[PDB]
Amino acid sequence: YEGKIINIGGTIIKARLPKARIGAFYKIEPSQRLAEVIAIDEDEVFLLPFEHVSGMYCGQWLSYQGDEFKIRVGDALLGRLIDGIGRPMESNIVAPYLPFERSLYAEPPDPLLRQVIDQPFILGVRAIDGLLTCGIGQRIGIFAGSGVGKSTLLGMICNGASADIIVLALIGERGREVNEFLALLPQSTLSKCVLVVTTSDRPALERMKAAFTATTIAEYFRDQGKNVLLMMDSVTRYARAARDVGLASGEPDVRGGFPPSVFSSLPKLLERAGPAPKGSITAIYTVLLESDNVNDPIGDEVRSILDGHIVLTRELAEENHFPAIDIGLSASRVMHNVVTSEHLRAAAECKKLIATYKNVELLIRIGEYTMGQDPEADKAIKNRKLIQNFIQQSTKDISSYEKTIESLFKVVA
Amino acid sequence: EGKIINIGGTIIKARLPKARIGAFYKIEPSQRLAEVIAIDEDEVFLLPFEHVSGMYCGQWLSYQGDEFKIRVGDALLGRLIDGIGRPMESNIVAPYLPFERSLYAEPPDPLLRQVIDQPFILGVRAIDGLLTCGIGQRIGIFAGSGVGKSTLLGMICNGASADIIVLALIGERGREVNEFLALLPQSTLSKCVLVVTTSDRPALERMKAAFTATTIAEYFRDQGKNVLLMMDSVTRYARAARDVGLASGEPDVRGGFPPSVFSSLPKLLERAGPAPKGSITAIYTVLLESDNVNDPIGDEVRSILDGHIVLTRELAEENHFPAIDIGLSASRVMHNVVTSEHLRAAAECKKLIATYKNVELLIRIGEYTMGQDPEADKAIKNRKLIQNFIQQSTKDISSYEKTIESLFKVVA
Amino acid sequence: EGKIINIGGTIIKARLPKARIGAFYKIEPSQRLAEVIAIDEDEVFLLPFEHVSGMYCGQWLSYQGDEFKIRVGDALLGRLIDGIGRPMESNIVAPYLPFERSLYAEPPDPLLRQVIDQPFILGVRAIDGLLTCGIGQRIGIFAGSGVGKSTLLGMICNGASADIIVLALIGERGREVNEFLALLPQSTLSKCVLVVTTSDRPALERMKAAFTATTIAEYFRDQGKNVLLMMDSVTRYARAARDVGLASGEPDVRGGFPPSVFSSLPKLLERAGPAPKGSITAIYTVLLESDNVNDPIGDEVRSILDGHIVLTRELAEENHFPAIDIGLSASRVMHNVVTSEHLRAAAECKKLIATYKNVELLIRIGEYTMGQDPEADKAIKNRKLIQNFIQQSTKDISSYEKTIESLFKVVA
Amino acid sequence: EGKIINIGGTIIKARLPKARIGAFYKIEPSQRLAEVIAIDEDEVFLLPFEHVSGMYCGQWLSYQGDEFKIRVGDALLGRLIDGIGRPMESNIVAPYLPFERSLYAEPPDPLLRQVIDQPFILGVRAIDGLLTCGIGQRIGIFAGSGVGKSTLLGMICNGASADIIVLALIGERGREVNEFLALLPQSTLSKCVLVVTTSDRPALERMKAAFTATTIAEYFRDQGKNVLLMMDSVTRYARAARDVGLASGEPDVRGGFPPSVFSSLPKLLERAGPAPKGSITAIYTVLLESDNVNDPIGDEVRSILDGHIVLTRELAEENHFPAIDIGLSASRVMHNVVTSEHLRAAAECKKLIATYKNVELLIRIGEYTMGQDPEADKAIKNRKLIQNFIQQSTKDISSYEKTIESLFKVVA
Ligand SMILES: Nc1ncnc2c1ncn2[C@@H]1O[C@H](COP(=O)(O)OP(=O)(O)O)[C@@H](O)[C@H]1O
Ligand SMILES: Nc1ncnc2c1ncn2[C@@H]1O[C@H](COP(=O)(O)OP(=O)(O)O)[C@@H](O)[C@H]1O
Ligand SMILES: Nc1ncnc2c1ncn2[C@@H]1O[C@H](COP(=O)(O)OP(=O)(O)O)[C@@H](O)[C@H]1O
Ligand SMILES: [Mg+2]
Ligand SMILES: [Mg+2]
Ligand SMILES: [Mg+2]
């Protein structure tokens, strides 16, 4: 009725329709599909469709629906799967009564009301609780290459950790995995868990807005006053989708691909999940790196945004050192507040023992090390197979927080 | 009805008013085909099905349908298919196929995938004992050029018992069609469809042949069969899509490639997996732009598939065949498939392989004294047993039971 | 017929309507031709055959034929052709060449090719023994500059015994025509066709010489006789196609090269090989842009040809001539054309060379004792035999039987 | 004529209708020529080199010729010529120079350019006895900085056996050219024709100095003499051509260099070889560095020339002048310009050089006893005579029969 699509191809369509707001969405009038206005020029506007672009033609009419895309949240979506758009995935069910219609884009808390985090958030993995340590309210990231340990360690964390609500966002990832995450979490955890699932075949928009859907649901269950655990698998899939949308809309190319929209819109998403006046969100974001280098565009940006980073190395997965986290290269920015002085000092001594062996390792292999002429090299060797049973852990094992402390005190001696 | 206004070398563009995207057209005097890929308000970019030599400005385009659909049916078993669905072998009669299928279908719904828990034996001892294939697992074979990819698919063509074998040979040597017909017996060739487009063929016909292989494998999946799909150098599809996507005016997001080859590789690889009715277990061969595993398409296909088998050139020069690097290889479902003593025997064997590659320069130069480290002596004493368990000739196939009993014997 | 509106150094833009792509035109005040590459509405982008340095704006184009066709006949034997197709011998009267045909031809059908199982005796002893070649395959010589490619083609040209030999010299040192013409006797020159372009010649004639050499070789193939196409530096064709593609407005995708180079190599290299009627055994040399085999164009030619002889500079400096590195090299038909104990002996001789290369540090500074590895003691005992087997001089030639019995002698 | 439309900083545009390409136009306020490089419809591109700042919108041009020409003649001996072709020494008058050559000629017909057969006498005992030059060989000396390039190069100037030497110095400074030409006497400046352009001159004149020296040496070839051309620093020819080609607007293909540099080096240094009348024996210089390792100009120059000399650094940090490392350097045309006994006596000395290198790094750690090998002990007894034969002072010139008999008394 209003405008006409004049340009079809790639990821974005372009239509002639005047007096368009930005962000408002539009039904393709003979086709039931609908599209969001992402960028406006004088009379031609860039739209981004929700579905496939095939089948369209020039002059196809474009009706009007709403001024902002909002999702529909409620208390009645625990234990239930949600799409990236906001719809429920499963069709066996009777549809819920979700009463509260929330906008997708919202504001972080005031920086003066976000209190200092000083309570440890127990995950269950011995390395990431003993050496590094989380806190109720931080947002930690898991940095790895392709197929190293990210989804296996996030499954261990979801198995071991406990929170009032658990929001788990499987964005950009293979469809085989939505049943493995429903398999390894129990019935009591499925009583309090919302999955937000977007497979990698889905369009740019669903794979781009599923992260904002999961963050909005976590903010809703925060505002009731509950400690909610957010877990987002491959936030770099959001980054790739924002890349190809922003490049198709005609933007420049800074820091290896990646328009300014990506690096300017990551903190508008990652700053929304932390401590708050009522409740808190403990977010865990996994990051895929374009090589094994940690110094990616997106890897370095997300490392400079978050509150702690767990870097997993492929060269430790070649040796079956699982979980493959690299202790010298990873860090946790709040463990000096959330734990006492004995644990922090013992963790410091164990980290320095690991780095000391990593310096001593190569000249043992080619056969030039001499015992006796260095007191702290031998101390890093005499303990080494004792510390590795603390630093590497089976998948079907959870560890208590007091066994972790006593194991670290026995290791560090 | 409209007329061509330029020819660019890869794609053409034309003055078609109000044309559908995806629709294909006949170039009216000379009997060829092209299809719409982009629209600029009256000027459509078209990708021709053939070579572009001979064309001129003002050449008409008659209309033929809204979608290039292939003619599929049950009489494809035992015969060879061109990259866009046509039969190749002119020696025999044209087959009769009843149904039409488009090349672009949706993956099965993620709630209906039913996590894979049954082993798929291959015949290679390294991808039985130390890696293990599930029925529904999609696997990749990552190597450089001439490292052993095709040799290993030839090993696991006559070793894997599946109901329908749909083999795609996109972007490779014309000489090989006969060699992959000289490794398959008639008890295998009677159930094997062999889709093949070679390196000569146009960029559309190497782009749109992996979709033909997946569509045929989905027709044989929906009947209820366990299909074994296997493609040769899916990076030839990736390079054809690079060429067309750069000719159509897209940027260069990573290592040479447009974003549309990164966003259209999952919606080909995600269709081959476990399903409610039937299953497709697929094996994708991936060529790397060097011997680095961190190629862009190598990295993306490693982050899509359910298992990667990395073959290195170093082991090929060492005459260690098949050249599988056990450290860089992984199978994402081995633990859901094998028994637990099998799993810990596999982990101990990979520990022994890594420990020998630690202590090898310590024993060769002469500093390793026999008795210092209580795992390196295990590795040294079991080196040759591990090595003739890992290596295998092309015409030797192993079963599952003999492989795991030799694994238990070698690892302890 | 049309004027010229742009002259750009390589691509000139004529304003002439209804022009067919592939057609060539004359610049009518002169006798120099130009071939159409791309078109627009009424502006065709075309490439001149000679250099561009004498042209002005309004300069007409007479129409010549719609495709560029060389004239081939049976009287090209013993002649000298350039990359356009003209004779170079002014001292000899021009022959009678009744047929004409275009330079762009499809390969044989992939099923009408056959599995090659007959050896091609080169004469070089190392290649014949350890690596070996089949009648109808495409071997490829990879080296640096000045490592010894050309010398090995001269050796392999005196030694081989094909019916017709079509030696192409593309983008090469003009001094060498008489040196490749002096190592041939008259008994081989009477059956050999020689196609010579030079590094001085422009980016079309250096680009079009490979296609005319392969067209002449396909003519003598279609007469039904085993021909031998030897091509000197096919990478000069790759450089010329890079310049033509980048002048025509193509993007870099890998190492400086456009997509059109990587799309135009496989059809050139894939029209040679087996055939229903005859065979065309091809030996291509590839100049790697440094002394490394992971050149973009070196890797893409290795992933097309079936077999590769990788020469190294570290052996050429140490007077290991010819400088074939036996570990880096391969031949994809070795297992198929020769007997089984020959395959076993060659495989463990290659393994013996590799296991000396992983020992010799223990010998140069004294860390090796005799009786702990009997294979290594046998290797150190037999190295003088083997480096009197791998090395041979240029005028040395050995038949196939003496090569096999010397291999059986050299590894016992 | 026409006037300047705009100046885009480096390249300028001017409306000259029906203006050819290659032509040179005269700016009307000053004495500054400029070159057309690309032609549009009625608005040609045009390239200034001297000075850009004092320019208008409306500054005029003036037509001179079809393209640029220089004045060659027999009275060029003992001169200094600019890269334009102007005589640099203004203290004398340019004599009756009657002939009129262009800068761009073709190399001879390769059938007429016949095999090079007789040795070129050079003077330096290393390049004359161990390696050997030829009459028509294009030697390229690879030097560092501080190895003794200019002193050796002056020995080549003075000790040569050629009728005319032609010297070009392409990128150099005034102290550098004066300290070079103050090393060779008036008896050598009688036959020499210096073509000097320095590192303050614009890049067009440094690019044209190579062509100017080549053309005047071809003129001295066509009247039947042995020309000895010496381009100093083709590295800086390549830097000048890179800067011109990038300023014209041309894509980077390899290491910072446009396609025009890589396609302009063969048509430069193929012109300097054997000929049907006379011959020109060329010797180029490339400056290799220690901050690069690839240096694409060094690789391309090594691919186009035939025979190269590597001047290493540590052969100068212990004062071994001339600093030629035999075994790292080689000449191709040696086996047909030397006799057989001189060939076998030359290979023996380089075998002894490599042999004492091996035995010396064996013995200086302490793993050698005197008495192992007679090739080692003959190397021991002949080291002082080898190092006495290779070492040659700045004033010492030897003949060729003395060189052969000194080689025969160093082979013993
Ligand atoms: N802690 C671990 N224990 C056992 N296996 C592991 C562990 N971490 C990684 N792996 C092995 O590595 C493979 C790939 O890990 P995955 O979690 O799928 O990577 P991604 O980070 O890409 O999702 C898994 O199949 C797994 O078997
Ligand atoms: N198991 C094996 N036994 C013997 N040779 C092998 C084996 N695996 C690889 N090769 C060698 O590698 C060659 C080329 O491998 P191929 O599979 O054709 O490479 P690509 O991966 O490029 O298709 C084989 O012809 C053979 O020479
Ligand atoms: N088999 C050999 N025996 C002795 N010398 C050789 C041999 N092969 C090459 N060489 C030396 O190497 C030089 C250059 O080899 P060539 O093949 O011309 O290099 P390119 O590969 O660049 O053409 C030759 O002049 C020759 O002296
Ligand atoms: Mg994952
Ligand atoms: Mg293959
Ligand atoms: Mg050569």
Numbering used by the authors:
A (entry chain D): 34 to 446
B (entry chain C), C (entry chain B), D (entry chain A): 35 to 446
Which text from the study accompanies this structure?
Substrate selection occurs in the cytoplasm and inner membrane, mediated by the export gate subcomplex (EscRSTUV in EPEC, and FliPQR, FlhB, FlhA in flagella) and the cytoplasmic ATPase complex (ATPase EscN, peripheral stalk EscL, and central stalk EscO; flagellar FliI, FliH and FliJ, respectively). The T3SS ATPase homologues are made distinct by their homohexameric construction, a presumed ancestral precursor to the heterohexameric rotary F1/V1-ATPases. The ATPase has been proposed to specifically enhance PMF-induced secretion efficiency, as well as to play a role in effector targeting, release from chaperones and unfolding prior to secretion. Each EscN monomer displays three sub-domains: the N-terminal oligomerization domain (residues 1–102), a cluster of curved β-sheets; the ATPase domain (103–372), made up of a central Rossmann fold with seven parallel β-strands flanked by four α-helices on one side and three on the other; and the C-terminal domain (373–446), made up of four helices lining the central pore.
The EscN-EscO complex was subjected to single-particle cryo-EM, with 3D classification resulting in two primary classes that refined to high resolution. Class 1 (58,000 particles, 3.34 Å) reveals a homohexameric EscN pore lacking visible EscO density, while class 2 (55,000 particles, 3.29 Å) looks similar but with additional α-helical density for approximately half of a single EscO molecule resolved. The final refined model spans residues 35–446 for all chains, excepting unresolved loop 323–329 on chain NF. The EscN hexameric structure shows marked asymmetry, with a prominent cleft between chains NA and NF. The N-terminal domain is largely static between subunits, with approximate C6 symmetry around the pore axis. Aligning each EscN chain by the N-terminal domain highlights a key pivot point between the N- and ATPase domains, with the ATPase and C-terminal domains essentially moving as a rigid body from subunit to subunit. Subunit NF, the most dynamic monomer with the least resolved density, is tilted back nearly 30° relative to the most inward angled subunit ND, indicating impressive motion at this pivot point. In four of the six EscN inter-subunit active sites, the Mg2+ADP-AlF3 transition state analogue was clearly visible; the resolution was insufficient to differentiate between AlF3 and AlF4, so AlF3 was used as the more abundant species at pH 7.530. The EscN active site location at the subunit interface and key motifs are conserved with the latter, including the P-loop (residues 179–185), catalytic glutamate (Glu206), and arginine finger (Arg366). The structure presented here shows that EscN can adopt similar C-terminal domain conformations; the lever is closed in nucleotide-bound sites T through D′, and open in nucleotide-free sites E and E′.
